[PDB]
Enzyme design. Structure first.
Site, PDB file in Angstrom:
ATOM      1  N   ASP C 166       0.827  -1.194   0.000  1.00 27.92           N
ATOM      2  CA  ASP C 166       0.000   0.000   0.000  1.00 27.92           C
ATOM      3  C   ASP C 166       0.863   1.246   0.000  1.00 27.92           C
ATOM      4  O   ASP C 166       2.069   1.227   0.307  1.00 27.92           O
ATOM      5  CB  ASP C 166      -1.019  -0.020   1.148  1.00 27.92           C
ATOM      6  CG  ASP C 166      -0.367  -0.014   2.491  1.00 27.92           C
ATOM      7  OD1 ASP C 166       0.196   1.039   2.850  1.00 27.92           O
ATOM      8  OD2 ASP C 166      -0.486  -1.045   3.179  1.00 27.92           O
ATOM      9  N   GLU C 246      23.294 -21.769 -16.394  1.00 28.16           N
ATOM     10  CA  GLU C 246      22.383 -20.902 -15.627  1.00 28.16           C
ATOM     11  C   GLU C 246      23.181 -19.833 -14.880  1.00 28.16           C
ATOM     12  O   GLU C 246      22.717 -18.705 -14.794  1.00 28.16           O
ATOM     13  CB  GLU C 246      21.394 -21.700 -14.738  1.00 28.16           C
ATOM     14  CG  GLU C 246      20.313 -22.359 -15.623  1.00 28.16           C
ATOM     15  CD  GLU C 246      19.239 -23.188 -14.938  1.00 28.16           C
ATOM     16  OE1 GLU C 246      19.320 -23.449 -13.745  1.00 28.16           O
ATOM     17  OE2 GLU C 246      18.306 -23.606 -15.663  1.00 28.16           O
TER      18      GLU C 246
END
Ligand code: MG
Ligand code: MG
Ligand code: MG
Ligand code: MG
Lengths: 719, 719, 360
Positions: C166, C246
């Site tokens: 928020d 990776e």
């Protein structure tokens, strides 16, 4: 603008705000690249290629399985390429083989706008338009196909037509010929079409395009009440005021087919043109056939802009009548007023009544010729019934002129009744199949307008009538569909004959206002609007139903083209009662006029007529030339609301008809469109002033109703 | 039951739960009154009559303007009646006139079920079925039309076919011939159709029927991957378990057209039959043409019951194979396992591998004939490649038998490669247009199977191969669509030739299990199922995609007909990985089988194969003969779920594949169908007991998933 | 650039059943002091961050044994437990001060450039009508004090992921851990929804291991990278378990994110698809001058014989010409917004793409 890039073999068509692009590929196929917002890019990058199971390959592609006309987007796809989708062209050759596999031969770019042999078409000058003509051919079919593209920059219109030539020695038949194809490699679409029936034309149907085809058309010999020859392909989510949408409009008054198909690879193909049903058109060696024109347009900003583009194109580049730019007489029509029960004296009484109210013209509708005292005789016998008229037509016209009134008359030249002198003399002039008793509709038959001798007889009779006096207006009606079709050329050649007669009539009588009609709006099409500046929109003159009919008609056609009259109540088609004021507001969205006997009205309603005429004449230029906006959807909303706005956006007329009524009414607001946001507008009657922004975002609250189906007009003037 | 009321001229067809009714009107037209829930009423009261503008009248209606075949509901509407809707029949007569206006002549009611000349059709005995044959004629067209209705009471099936006879002296052509028409005077409907592409067939598309036509079809020479020849017209609001719905299914493996139209009077017309495209079928004096059959059915209680009616009809009244009522060998197929890269030795190794796992049969797929080491040669050269096989086919079969395994083989008899001995000898045997280079697809061409000489050559070659040893199974493939169609009889006569060959093959080899194939499910139709008890459902063997393909296929076709194999991952068509267990659960909704090299699998996956085979064999009768229920919609839901229930409702197998995964998963319940509400059922693995009511209303909670695309099977037994 | 030592470093926190409230470094577990650990990390060229959860207490803690009345509870009533912990009553200054002092001692041990402030359960046993509001005043007071004392600190907000995602928290924190779900496919939806109000720069997003710890789903390393670049970026896995290929992807991912960091964080954001309904999750960021754009796409659906999927761009200048970097092809903005660009055909599931455009 029209551009050719010879290296990429790309043709680009630019309008003011749109771009349409196509490419000749390395095998000679004419592929469609793009149609949408204006771009200078080469859009060939959108083409992709994969080995797609069962999508096969031209022999000329060799071992490349990734090249298939069953996948690729095309300008003019055909039966005989390996494409399995709906197609634009099918030729049956001189050996019985249905195949056309068209490869590029040549092109030309020309200034100006092509014309079509024996057919209406968009017109423009050499500065306003350019034409691209592409020649494709199939040497095995021995056919040569000329694709015509007309570009009208300011109008954001691209037209398409086709000429097909037999280059072999034996006869071929044309079995399917569309005018336009749009292939989309991607997109989710809805299809908008305009369906109805006699006395309820052009209802809007909008549905998503699911996998498969949505199709509609006419084999009635006419464009029809049932499905108008018009389509909008709207991207999912497109509204009146936002989003992509594409139109196709057929400039044609005969048979047609429209097909929209979402395919196996989520591509969309849209076709419009001639119907393949009852169409097997013979073409001898060296002969050419012309497919009627389609007007295409694109809007990036919703349906209202698309319609406005069509309205402007039709008013300024289709309609040839001088009355596009002139006041049109306010008329009263005898049909609902008297049906067949009139005399010359009662026509003059109607003139007297109408003159005292400010009406300009009386139209003597059906019932004046032969022994036409009902609809069971006399079509083909276009001799004045002087017994009924109590004298000659020349004398009647003069008597009407003496009341200060112009005169108009109804004709139905394409038709014949068995009970007529003409039919007793020439029964073989009716369209029929030898040995077969024909379909009857309104107890009449079609005349075979493919035959010059037939047309000439009727044309001569009509000339005798029109030469009796000053007739300023003709309503040309047509009251049944074609049946008993005896050959595969008939549907097309019949309509050539209609247009030939219509062209001859308009040329002989260039000051005549010709209102088209076909049981109302049964041939409400741009083909007719080339000759007529207005078409009787519907036999339904119920104001409430007219809100829907006029709404639907506005998607392609200008308000100025919509014949609309104030009629009596209870309405003759529905039995519904509406106020005189509401009838007036609704009929002003069109030609205006009256179709009732004013002698039966109250003095208060007679005074309403006087005020209505003053109002219509005051706003006639605004209604006819102004930018039109649908402000509500009468299928779903509380009101039918529309408005017209001047070009400078300094004047607007807003019209509203309420459709729903309940107690303790909520406040209904009408939100306006097409104004200048920062300008201040004065509402005339109230004297209140509003910004354009306010009027478009909040709108104005309607006065509370006290009776059903109440109507309103609001006029706004820029300060 | 079939009843005639001579006074009202009404024919009523009753099944166990449905009634279909028609009437000969006073003019001789065959009107459709009703199809729906069982009733003893005369439904002629539903007919209404009004003067509807532009809907015209037979001459024989005289002055009655309220009688129009453009409005009235009809059994078999035609071009030439004044009807302007889509129509079922168009005849072009010996003078070039397209017209058929059919009036009643006679009828017969017969016990038993009619058969069709050269075509598959529903069959039944004289106690199970009755046939109504109605004769109509048009004396001007000189055509006589025999409408055939087959009534199978217990199955709630009504079949329709048509025979058209030329009764004149000159040749006519049949230009459109539907098998079935349903006219509804009222109702709001959705149209369900099954669309796709190669390797993704029979996706469900369900949309409302708007004004206009929804149409789909095939001119590929095949029933097609793109649109199956099947349609459901569902009343608005109909679900799997409630509401009216109507099916039409074409018992045909060639071209077709389906049209559903909502008209100007809010009526609906549904048509299914032959495509009018590439169909101009010549009929000499006195000759008869047969339209392939449509199977109609009605359910008042939703889509699941409708499908079950079709499943039962197909299993018990279409499929003629002995394998409908027998265990079918669990097979392994060499195609994804090896493609073209195999020898006789590696086929025997596959047999050895498969035998150790409990597999019953090895199928040697494409690559065994001519010099077929890729897909660029040898179709038409059906001689065993003994170099590649390291010996004769007879020896190979014996070597496989010695491993305890049955043998199957792939053929593609309809096709030819330019690179073949056959093509070098007979290039004119390929379907082609003289002078035109043909479309190639998979670098091959169609053989003209309309020609006996062509068929006989290939049939003889295939017989030599099949006579080399005990071959228990043939997969008959067909890997491209028809193009270069040279005449208007070809599409139809080609398919007659296919069926003739197929009938000859099945008659010569009556113990053969014939699996139909066409690049997967490119001819997945009831016409093929007459000969084959299973059809390779799709080349897509991805378990997740197969949930959708199998779902769509189940709307008309029984699970037993769906060829389905466990294949390797990453999947060869999608690149997706799925668990071995999920592949197994999905492939058990069909024939089951394997299509991979088991030598590449882990010991754990080999043991899964052993357990999978035991599971499938344990449930084979239930899966194949049980009542099928779709328990979810894989297009929208969290799971693909289905189940099969024994006839006595005492046993059920439930299958579930999860389709969606998120964290903190919600509990998903599978709700069962088709059980006895008050019965108590034992779930086998868990040992828990539930009432049928509980299982159908609350269902059972799925165990929480720990990996993607997890699958489940639950077995229930009535206590 | 930085290692964040998450939960497990304090008290005897060897699982989530003890020690919240006991914000003393577990020097046994850390094999020495926190100051020494920070220095050892700095010596590897790395910055240091740390996780805290100051609003919470476990019954099994020294703090709770000393002050059981500091937990939010109703007198006489046994409280709801969630993650086997309780809320501290942050409406009380004495409670906040105790915890604030402990956290200051920890943060003062060395250069800690980053704090992740978590909060792992909802409030229950609410004892009065002022508590919900005054509790949050107390949280904000602590947060303001912390940010004022440590103004160079990057504070990442957290509450079991995005449980307090928020604008109130964003006043203090420039980023919030968007979700505990680090599954790339689910993250497309979570990040899409979060974008309706909140900037990409605020969305904490990390490349994590597969099979994913929350869903069990496997996704390619490249797809995880494209999805996590729509946010803060970062990693949350042990790279020692990865393949060399990776590891090299990580090197290239970091270079890519750093190259586009300003564009992603400051550029105008456009949702280009709806991942609830569409074939792809697609988004893009466009510079203020509209001269640069980065387009990201994750495929969501796979079938055989794939249709061509186009990504339609937004927010460009219609008449400008844009160079697509990798391909070297040039397009007008109008073309890119109306027709878009065709995606390369996929060969595996959940494939992802990034396209960079530069105005010529
Ligand atoms: Mg035709
Ligand atoms: Mg058609
Ligand atoms: Mg035909
Ligand atoms: Mg068709």
């Amino acid at each position: 603008a029209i551009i050719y890039n010879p290296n990429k073999k790309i043709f680009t068509l630019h309008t003011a705000h749109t771009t349409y692009q196509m490419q000749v590929d390395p095998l000679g196929y004419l592929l469609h690249l793009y149609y949408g917002e204006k771009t200078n890019s080469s859009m060939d990058y959108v083409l992709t290629y994969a080995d797609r199971g069962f999508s096969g390959n031209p022999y000329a592609a060799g071992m490349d399985r990734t090249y298939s006309l069953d996948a690729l987007p095309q300008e003019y796809p055909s039966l005989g390429t390996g494409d399995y989708r709906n197609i634009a062209l099918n030729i049956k050759n001189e050996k019985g083989v249905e195949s056309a596999d068209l490869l590029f031969k040549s092109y030309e770019i020309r200034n100006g706008k092509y014309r079509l042999q024996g057919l209406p078409a968009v017109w423009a000058d050499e500065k306003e338009a350019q034409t691209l003509e592409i020649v494709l051919a199939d040497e095995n079919a021995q056919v040569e196909v000329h694709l015509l593209y007309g570009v009208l920059e300011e109008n954001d219109v691209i037209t398409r037509s086709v000429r097909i030539k037999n280059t072999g020695t034996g006869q071929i038949t044309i079995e399917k010929a569309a005018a336009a194809c749009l292939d989309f490699v991607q997109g989710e679409f809805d299809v908008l079409r305009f369906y109805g029936k006699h006395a309820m034309e052009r209802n809007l149907e909008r549905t998503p395009l699911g996998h498969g085809t949505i199709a509609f058309g006419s084999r009635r010999g006419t464009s029809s009440h049932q499905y108008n020859p018009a389509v909008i392909l709207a991207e999912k989510g497109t509204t009146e005021t936002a989003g992509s949408c594409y139109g196709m409009l057929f400039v044609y008054s005969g048979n047609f087919s429209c097909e929209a198909e979402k395919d196996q690879f989520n591509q969309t193909r849209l076709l419009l043109g001639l119907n393949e049903e009852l169409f097997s058109y013979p073409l001898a060696s060296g002969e050419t056939f012309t497919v009627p024109e389609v007007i295409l347009s694109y809007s990036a900003e919703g349906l209202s802009a698309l319609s406005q583009q069509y309205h402007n194109c039709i008013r300024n580049h289709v309609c040839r009548s001088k009355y596009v730019h002139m006041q049109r007489p306010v008329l009263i029509n005898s049909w609902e007023a008297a049906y067949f029960d009139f005399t010359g004296d009662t026509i003059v009484d109607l003139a007297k009544e109408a003159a005292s109210l400010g009406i300009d013209m009386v139209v003597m509708d059906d019932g004046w010729f032969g022994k036409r005292n009902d609809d069971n005789s006399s079509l083909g016998d276009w001799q004045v019934n002087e017994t009924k008229l109590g004298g000659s037509l020349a004398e009647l016209i003069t008597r009407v002129h003496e009341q200060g009134m112009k005169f108009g008359i109804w004709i139905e030249p394409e038709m014949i009744n068995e009970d007529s002198d003409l039919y007793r003399a020439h029964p073989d002039w009716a369209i029929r199949i030898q040995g077969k008793k024909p379909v009857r509709s309104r107890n009449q038959l079609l005349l075979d307008f493919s035959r010059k001798e037939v047309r000439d007889c009727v044309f001569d009779q009509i000339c005798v009538v029109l030469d009796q006096g000053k007739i300023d207006y003709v309503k040309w009606d047509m009251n049944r569909s074609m049946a008993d079709v005896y050959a595969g050329n008939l549907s097309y050649d019949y309509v050539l004959g209609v247009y030939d007669f219509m062209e001859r009539l308009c040329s002989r009588y260039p000051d005549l206002l010709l209102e088209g009609c076909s049981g109302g709006g049964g041939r409400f099409d741009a083909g007719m609007l080339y000759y007529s500046p207005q078409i009787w929109c519907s036999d339904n003159t119920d104001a409430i139903n007219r809100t829907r009919i006029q709404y639907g008609t506005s998607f392609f056609y200008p308000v100025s083209a919509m014949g609309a009259h104030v009629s009596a109540v209870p309405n003759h088609q529905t039995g519904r009662v509406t106020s005189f004021h509401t009838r007036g507001v609704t009929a002003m969205a069109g030609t205006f006029g009256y179709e009732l006997n004013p002698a039966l009205l109250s003095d208060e309603e007679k005074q309403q007529i006087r005020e209505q005429i003053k109002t219509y004449k005051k706003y006639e230029t605004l209604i006819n030339e102004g930018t039109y906006w649908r402000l509500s959807d009468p299928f779903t909303d509380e009101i039918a609301a529309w408005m017209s706005v001047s070009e400078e956006q300094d004047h607007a007329l807003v019209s509203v008809v309420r459709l729903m009524a309940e107690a303790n009414q909520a406040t209904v607001y009408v939100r306006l469109r097409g104004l200048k946001p920062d300008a201040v507008y004065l509402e005339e009657q109230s004297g209140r002033q509003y910004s354009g922004a306010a009027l478009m975002h909040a709108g104005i609250p309607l006065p509370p109703f006290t009776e059903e189906y109440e109507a309103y007009q609001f006029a706004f003037t820029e300060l």
